[PDB]
Amino acid sequence: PFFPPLYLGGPEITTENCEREPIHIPGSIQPHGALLTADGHSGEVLQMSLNAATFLGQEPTVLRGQTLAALLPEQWPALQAALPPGCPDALQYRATLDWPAAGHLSLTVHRVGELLILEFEPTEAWDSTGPHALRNAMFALESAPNLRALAEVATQTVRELTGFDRVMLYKFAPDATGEVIAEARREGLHAFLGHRFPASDIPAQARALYTRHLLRLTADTRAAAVPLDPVLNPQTNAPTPLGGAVLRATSPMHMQYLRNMGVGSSLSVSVVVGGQLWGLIACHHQTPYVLPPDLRTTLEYLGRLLSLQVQVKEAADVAAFRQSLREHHARVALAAAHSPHDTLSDPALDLLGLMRAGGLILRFEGRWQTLGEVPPAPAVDALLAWLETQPGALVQTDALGQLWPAGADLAPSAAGLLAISVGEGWSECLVWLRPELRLEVAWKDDLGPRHSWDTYLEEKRGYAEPWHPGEIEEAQDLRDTLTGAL
C-alpha cells in the first residue's frame, strides 16, 4: 500500500518507510519549467504551477478559467488529434511555440484520464545539433562487437553529446540489485565501475515508473519544488498524477542522496528489453544542469537504440556461450565413451571450467574425490548426506546457507552448489561448488554510495555467483549422457 501524499496528511518520508512514498503524485514541479492541467473535453485550464505566471509572461488570474483554444489556437486541434481519449499517459505530443515574452517554448502534453497535462520548457528555434547526433550515436552503437564494448561506447557517447561529468550504465541482476557495468567520467573523479548497489536503493514504484516512462530528470538537487494551484484536481478533488510529467518534482529522499554524492543534476534514460527494465543510463553533474528538450530527445532516441542493441548482443552472447559449453561437453563425452573417477579427474578435461566452479565432488563406486577448493572431508560427507535427502535429479542454489542451514559455516569454501545424480537416487553424483562472492570497493554512516556498497555486501553474505541458466541446462544434458555411459 501507498502512504498519502504530504499535502493530504501523509506521513513524513523516512529511511524506514521510503518504499511506500507516492512519488507519482508530489503535487509540485521542478522550477525550470511550468505545468498546466486542462479538461480533456472543454480545455478549461484548471491547475497551475505558481511559477507559470512568470514563465508564460501572462497574469496567473487570467490564465485560469481560460480555455486552451484561446491560449493556443494553433495547437489545440492538433493537440486533441494527437491525444485521443483513452490513450496511455506515456503517449506524449510535443510542439514548439513562439511567444514574444518568453521566446521559443517547448510544449509537451500527455493525457491522464480526463486531464490533459501540458509542460513548458524554454527551447531552441531550430536545432541542427540533433540530425547528425543521431547519426553518429547510431553508427557508434552499431559498431560494437560485444556487450562490454557496447556499454562503454554508449556511456562515452552520452557524455560526448551532453557534457555530463559522469555517465554510467547500470545492469539489473535477477535479484533486483544493480551494477555499474560501464562508465565514462571526467578526469579527477572516483570510479563506480564494478560497484554494486542493493535493490532497496531504487524502490519498486520508481522501477515501474521508469519502465513506463523512459526518461526522468532532476535538474537541481537543492532547489525547492513549485506547487500546483490548486494542489488537487478540481474535477475529482484527487491528487494529480505526475508520473508522465517530465517536470515531476523529484522525491526529497533521492535528492538527499544525490546531495550526499555532490551531484547537482541527474538524468536517467531507461533501458527496457522485452517489457522488463534491463538497465538504466545514469548521468551525474556537480553543478545544476538543465538539458534542453531537443538534445534530451536525442538521448531518448539513444535509449531505444541501446535497448535494441542490448537485446541483440545478449542473444549472441548466450548463443556463443551455449555453443562453447556444447564443445566442452563433446570434449567430455568422447572421454566418457572410452572410460569414472580417474577419467573425470583429468585436468585436461577441466570439469571446473565447464561450470566455472572452484570446487568439484565426484561420488562413484562408494567413494568420493575432490578437485579444487573444497571444504574438509567430514564437511564433504555431511554435504553428500544432505544431497541424498533432496529429491529430484538436479540441485541448484546461489547460497547453500539458505537451503542447508548446517552448511552455513562452509559457505566461504562452497556458497553456490550445482549437483546432478548419475543414477537414480544419489549413490552416484557430481557436485560443483562455488566460493563466497567476494568483491572490493570501487574507490559516512548516513545514506550514500559508501553505505550502499557496505549494505550490498552485507545483504549478499553467504551468496555466490549465480549459476547461468545455460550451465543448468548443460548440467541436466550431461547427467543424461553419463547415465548411459556406464
Ligand X SMILES: */C=C/C1=C(C)C(=O)N/C1=C\C1=NC(=C\c2[nH]c(/C=C3/NC(=O)C(C=C)=C3C)c(C)c2CCC(=O)O)/C(CCC(=O)O)=C1C
Binding-site entries:
18
Interaction of residue 19 with ligand X, rule CB under 6 A: yes
In sign, the C-alpha dihedral spanning 313, 318, 323, 327 is: positive
Q: Of 17-25, 339-347, 365-373, 408-416, which part binds ligand X (CB under 6 A)? A: 17-25
DSSP string, 140-194: HHHT--SHHHHHHHHHHHHHHHH--SEEEEEEE-TTS-EEEEEEEE-SSS---TT
* Least distance in angstroms from the C-beta of 105 to ligand X: 23
Binding mask 237-266 for ligand X (x = CB under 6 A): -------------xx-xx--xx-------x
Residues pairing with 99 in the sheet = 103
Residues pairing with 44 in the sheet = 67
Q: Of 123-131, 331-339, 408-416, 424-432, which part binds its own copies (CB under 8 A)? A: 123-131
Is residue 119 within 8 Å of 245, Cβ to Cβ?
A: yes
* Least distance in angstroms from the C-beta of 188 to its own copies: 24
* Least distance in angstroms from the C-beta of 458 to its own copies: 38
Interaction of residue 274 with its own copies, rule CB under 8 A: yes
Interaction of residue 149 with its own copies, rule CB under 8 A: no
| Cα within 13 Å of Cα(84), Cβ side | 1
- In whole angstroms, how far apart are CA 35 and each of 69, 234, 253? 17, 16, 23
Q: Residue 98 corresponds to which cell in the numbers above?
A: 513562439
Q: Of 56-64, 107-115, 201-209, 223-231, which part binds ligand X (CB under 6 A)? A: 201-209
Tell me whether residue 200 or residue 369 sits nearer to ligand X (CB atom). 200
In sign, the C-alpha dihedral spanning 69, 74, 77, 81 is: negative
Q: Of 92-100, 325-333, 343-351, 405-413, which part binds its own copies (CB under 8 A)? A: 92-100
Angle between helix axes 469-485 and 293-337 (nearest 10 degrees) is 10
Interaction of residue 41 with its own copies, rule CB under 8 A: no
Q: Which of residues 45-84 bind its own copies (CB under 8 A)?
A: 82
SS3 content of the chain, % helix, strand, coil (to 5): 35, 25, 40
Is residue 239 within 8 Å of 227, Cβ to Cβ?
A: no
Where on the chain is the footprint of its own copies (CB under 8 A)?
Answer: 82, 87-88, 90-96, 126-127, 131-132, 134-136, 138-140, 142-143, 274-275, 293-294, 297-298, 300-301, 304-305, 307-308, 311-312, 315
Site residues (vs ligand X, CB under 6 A): 15, 18-19, 23, 192, 195, 197, 200-203, 206, 209, 216, 218, 250-251, 253-254, 257-258, 266, 268, 282, 447, 449, 452
